[PDB]
Design an enzyme around this catalytic site. Structure first.
Site, short mmCIF file in Angstrom:
data_model
loop_
_atom_site.label_atom_id
_atom_site.label_comp_id
_atom_site.label_asym_id
_atom_site.label_seq_id
_atom_site.Cartn_x
_atom_site.Cartn_y
_atom_site.Cartn_z
N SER A 97 -3.95 -8.46 0.63
CA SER A 97 -3.43 -7.81 1.67
C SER A 97 -3.55 -8.59 3.05
CB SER A 97 -3.95 -6.24 1.75
OG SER A 97 -3.42 -5.73 2.92
N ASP A 237 3.66 -7.54 6.28
CA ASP A 237 2.65 -7.96 5.99
C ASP A 237 2.81 -9.03 4.79
OD1 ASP A 237 3.31 -6.38 3.84
OD2 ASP A 237 1.15 -5.37 3.55
N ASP A 239 2.00 -9.69 1.56
CA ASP A 239 2.58 -9.06 0.15
C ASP A 239 3.77 -8.30 0.64
OD1 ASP A 239 1.17 -6.90 0.97
OD2 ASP A 239 0.52 -6.41 -0.88
N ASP A 241 5.03 -5.46 1.21
CA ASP A 241 5.29 -3.99 0.95
C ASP A 241 5.05 -3.23 2.11
OD1 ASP A 241 2.67 -4.17 1.15
OD2 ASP A 241 2.23 -3.20 -0.57
MG MG Z 1 0.74 -5.05 1.80
#
Ligand code: MG
Ligand code: JV4
Length: 448
Positions: A97, A237, A239, A241
């Site tokens: 993250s 961000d 990754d 999502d």
């Molecule tokens: Mg994320």
């Protein structure tokens, strides 16, 4: 006493003392024992340690007789999507993250990409890993490499009518995370002109770890929008999502207002659907959903609760103020890509700026933004707040912390399930002065 890396919703920890290749192999072995029959989908983010953590995960899975579908470098939503699309028994995304550079982690899901949380499998996995002193067996199952994104890409594009799209100029800011690869694969199917900022994936993060919420990272997107006269800007961000929107003035749009905007966008397609929302900030969403013919459905914050409530309600869309947006057709999972495709379509179709689409709503329901407090005694601090406002007799709801509705203003106050924090959200009925005085009042009582 317990492994620190195992949190309420995922695994995360400093490499290698909290998370390493041995623990990851042991996680793979223990995950194999928890899942129904089927193969397991694995993907990873741009962090430098991630591929080796995936390889150990796969090694433990295959030693337990699980076929592994390696979808490679990807976003978290691609693990969700491919797990449901390929009817896999489960999936794991190796992603850190936005934790510091020496950190990494994993997000685990079972069939149809249902989340595996502390109380739904993750602590069972933790306890197995904690006690597992068995010799590492050898792989009795295969790994297939499946990096084809066609089905994923086609599913993203199905949310909009491409013949109604205008050649908007869009700033896109991957923060050297992984989002730029998907933008580039979508781009031949789209009329937009992309202004690419921090576009190339680099796990060394030359421009900072991806986090559009930090003002210095916010400003890179804002300046690119203003400097190029873009219609709007998008940041992700690492990754991807989570997505974050900047209007044509460069102003960052508070995620609260995107819930009501995306709900109306979706409700135009699927009339009369239910829409799930969280309790932190509500009034604008309730109104926009109802005005668009939908049915709003209140639900505890947190992706596990959101997804589960969406499933039980057949809800078309679910939205959190914290930049998480969930879509029924997308396996009830969150996407950082679908939201900006939908907003671009709305801007193209309505002839209105992103700024004007949200401006009246921001005026009608001004909000504080989420305000976090690290206090000496959360329980005592919450009590000082409620005792102060008791004589006004607010309407109280305990779905998620404490929501107090006073008529012209309301607040939500909860403890975080991922951090030992108190989180505060305030909104008012068109009254900025009341918003400030009540926020400051509550803040002083919490700090007391
Ligand atoms: Mg994320
Ligand atoms: O506020 P929390 O710490 O309990 O939870 C946070 O992380 C969750 C999972 F990513 C989100 O679904 C919440 O909306 C967000 O607020």
């Amino acid at each position: 006493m317990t492994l620190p890396a195992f949190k309420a919703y995922d695994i995360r920890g400093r490499v290698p003392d909290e998370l390493n290749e041995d623990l990851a192999r042991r996680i793979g072995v223990a995950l194999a024992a928890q899942l129904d029959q089927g193969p397991v989908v694995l993907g990873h983010d741009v962090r430098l340690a991630s591929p080796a953590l995936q390889e150990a995960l796969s090694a433990g899975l295959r030693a337990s007789g699980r076929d592994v579908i390696d979808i490679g470098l990807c976003g978290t939503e691609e693990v969700y999507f491919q797990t449901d699309y390929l009817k896999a028994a489960g999936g794991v995304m190796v992603t850190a993250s936005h934790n510091p550079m020496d950190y990494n982690g994993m997000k685990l899901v079972r069939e149809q990409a249902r989340p595996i949380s502390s109380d739904t499998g993750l602590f069972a996995i933790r306890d197995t890993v904690a006690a597992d002193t068995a010799a590492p067996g050898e792989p009795t199952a295969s790994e297939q490499s499946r990096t084809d994104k066609t089905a994923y890409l086609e599913h993203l594009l199905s949310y909009v009518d491409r013949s109604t799209l205008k050649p908007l100029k869009l700033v896109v800011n991957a923060g050297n995370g992984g989002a730029g690869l998907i933008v580039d694969l979508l781009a031949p199917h789209l009329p937009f002109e992309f202004v690419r900022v921090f576009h190339e994936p680099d796990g060394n993060f030359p421009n900072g770890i991806p986090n559009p919420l930090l003002p210095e990272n916010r400003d890179a997107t804002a300046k690119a929008v203003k400097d190029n006269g873009a219609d709007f800007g998008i940041a992700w961000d690492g990754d991807f999502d989570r997505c974050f929107f900047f209007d044509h003035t460069g102003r960052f749009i508070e995620g609260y207002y995107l819930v009501g905007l995306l709900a109306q966008a979706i409700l135009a397609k699927q009339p009369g659907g239910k829409v799930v929302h969280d309790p932190r900030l509500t009034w604008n969403t309730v109104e926009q959903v109802e005005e668009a013919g939908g049915i709003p459905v209140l639900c505890k914050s947190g992706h596990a609760f959101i997804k589960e409530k969406m499933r039980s309600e057949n809800a078309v869309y679910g939205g959190e103020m914290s930049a998480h947006h969930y879509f029924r057709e997308f396996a009830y999972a969150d996407s950082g890509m679908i939201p900006w495709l939908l907003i671009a379509e709305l801007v193209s179709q309505s002839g209105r700026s992103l700024a004007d689409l949200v401006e009246a709503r921001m005026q009608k329901f001004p909000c504080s933004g989420e305000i976090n407090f690290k206090v000496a005694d959360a329980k005592a601090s919450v009590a000082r707040v409620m005792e102060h406002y008791a004589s006004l007799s607010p309407e109280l709801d305990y779905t998620d912390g404490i929501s107090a509705d006073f008529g012209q203003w309301r607040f939500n106050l909860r403890s975080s399930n991922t951090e030992p924090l108190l989180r505060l959200n305030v909104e008012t009925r068109g009254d900025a002065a009341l918003l400030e005085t009540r926020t400051q009042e509550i803040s002083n009582l919490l700090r007391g």
